[PDB]
Amino acid sequence: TGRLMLAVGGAVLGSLQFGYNTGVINAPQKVIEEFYTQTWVHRYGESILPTTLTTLWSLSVAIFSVGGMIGSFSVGLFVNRFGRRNSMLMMNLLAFVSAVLMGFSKLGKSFEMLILGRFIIGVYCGLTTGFVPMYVGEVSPTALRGALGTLHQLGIVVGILIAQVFGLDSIMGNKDLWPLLLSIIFIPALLQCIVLPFCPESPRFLLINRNEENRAKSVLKKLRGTADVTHDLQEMKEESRQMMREKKVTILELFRSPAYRQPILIAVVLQLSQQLSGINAVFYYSTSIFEKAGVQQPVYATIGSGIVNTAFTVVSLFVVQRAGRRTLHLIGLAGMAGCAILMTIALALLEQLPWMSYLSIVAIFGFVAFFEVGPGPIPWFIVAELFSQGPRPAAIAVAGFSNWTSNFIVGMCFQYVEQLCGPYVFIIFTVLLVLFFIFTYFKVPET
Ligand SMILES: CCCCCCCCCO[C@@H]1O[C@H](CO)[C@@H](O)[C@H](O)[C@H]1O
């Protein structure tokens, strides 16, 4: 466990990037929108329509996920064909070409470049949800493999908290320095783009995929200071027993077969339950939502949501090993439904009672807290237990496809639905939260 941390850490750097680019565009929205609306006027000799600006900026945050879906679709392709590290490494090209397209959308005078770079860094982020946990989950000793996949999660949530903090009016969330905010990705990226060639090609890859018995044999002795493991080698050839003794069923079979048509119904819904709960609304729009409430200095309440989120991600790890699977998923769903009620109250009585600005903050803090213990981790956990070593991969691509899809819908349409619907938006998310809650009570089993 010496040279190992180098490889693990450099990998997670890309889960950080996932953490950033996701929770970035939520603190400096009206700053770019001012860029949007001014750009429009100069160009088209006409001023921007409010709804235009809305769907336009909606697409800038949304088109991220169109990207990530494709990214997560293409994950299997690069991994097997190129190894894990040679993929992490080469995909930094995506990180750089998007960093440039956004951070020079400044004198570019083009919000296309901004949306495009958002797409591309969506692809990069889609691909990276697959590369990272994989790599970390072959490199690590099987014992420490549990406590170390922890870093892909943590990487994201911390990655988020940074996007928010860097987002401050006083850092890079301001009329002058928001392209360096959207671009500073490169400083993480180039770092990994340097660390990585010092990092080892996956042993389960050199042995099973690349069929190098001796070249793979050599990686571990470095990767493990004083282990030199016959146990790891027999495991890799027993992992290539069970993962290769049950046929890798394709996604396309999952659907055609009635045997699977039900387990797959559950896994998928669980993903809708995660995104259609309405979180990325509080993580794409935290600041705009806190404003409209009555919050003064809304980005701090955003970073409030940042800290609380990271806090309960760590608390979840403990509670997750302890309790049932749909225990946490229910309690999690519950609080979130009730918090989205507190919200719609605050957002409602705000006008008669000022300090509901505060109730907004309370609502959402416990609402993201309640999230990370429940619908956060549980719908992933359940798929790995709803499918054996054979249909399990096919199962994950569909899961991840629901996740990137219900994500696009919240991101693209949450602004649609805050205008036409007012301080009741969280009653939409409360009606879902209930439905979902109900669904899991009668249809999803313990695991
Ligand atoms: C055993 C595997 C466990 C998987 C752990 C998942 C941890 C929860 C992370 O979920 C993510 O939370 C973000 C905010 O925290 C959202 O922006 C994002 O859309 C959502 O997907």
From Swiss-Prot:
Result, substituting residue 204 to C: In GLUT1DS1 and DYT9
Catalytic activity field: D-glucose(out) = D-glucose(in)
Q: How is it modified after translation?
A: Phosphorylation at Ser-218 by PKC promotes glucose uptake by increasing cell membrane localization.
Effect in UniProt of substituting residue 403 to S: In EIG12; decreased glucose transport
Where are the glycosylation sites?
A: 37
* Principal cellular location given in the protein's record: membrane
| Keyword Acetylation annotated | yes
Effect upon mutating residue 325 to Q: In GLUT1DS1 and GLUT1DS2
The membrane spanning regions, by residue number, are 4-25, 59-79, 83-104, 113-136, 148-168, 178-198, 264-285, 299-320, 327-347, 358-380, 394-414, 422-442
Q: What is the effect of changing residue 287 to M?
A: In GLUT1DS1; 75% of wild-type glucose uptake activity
In terms of PROSITE patterns, this protein maps to: MFS, SUGAR_TRANSPORT_1, SUGAR_TRANSPORT_2
Effect after changing residue 83 to D: In GLUT1DS1; significantly decreases the transport of 3-O-methyl-D-glucose
Parts of the chain on the Extracellular side: 26-58, 105-112, 169-177, 286-298, 348-357, 415-421
Mutation effect (residue 197 to C): Abolishes glucose transport
Tell where it localizes: Cell membrane; Melanosome; Photoreceptor inner segment
Q: How does it sit in the membrane?
A: Multi-pass membrane protein
Q: How the protein is affected by changing residue 184 to C?
A: Strongly decreases glucose transport
Residues the record lists as Phosphoserine modifications: 218
Q: What is the effect of changing residue 145 to C?
A: In GLUT1DS1; 44% of wild-type glucose uptake activity
MF GO annotations: D-glucose transmembrane transporter activity; dehydroascorbic acid transmembrane transporter activity; fucose transmembrane transporter activity; identical protein binding; kinase binding; long-chain fatty acid transmembrane transporter activity; xenobiotic transmembrane transporter activity
Q: What tissue specificity is annotated for this entry?
A: Detected in erythrocytes (at protein level). Expressed at variable levels in many human tissues.
Q: Where is this site: Not glycosylated?
A: 403
Q: Which GO BP terms sit in this record?
A: cellular hyperosmotic response; cellular response to glucose starvation; cellular response to mechanical stimulus; central nervous system development; cerebral cortex development; D-glucose import; D-glucose import across plasma membrane; D-glucose transmembrane transport
Family recorded in the similarity comment: Belongs to the major facilitator superfamily. Sugar transporter (TC 2.A.1.1) family. Glucose transporter subfamily.
What is the official name of this protein in its record? Solute carrier family 2, facilitated glucose transporter member 1
State the organism named in the record. Answer: Homo sapiens (Human)
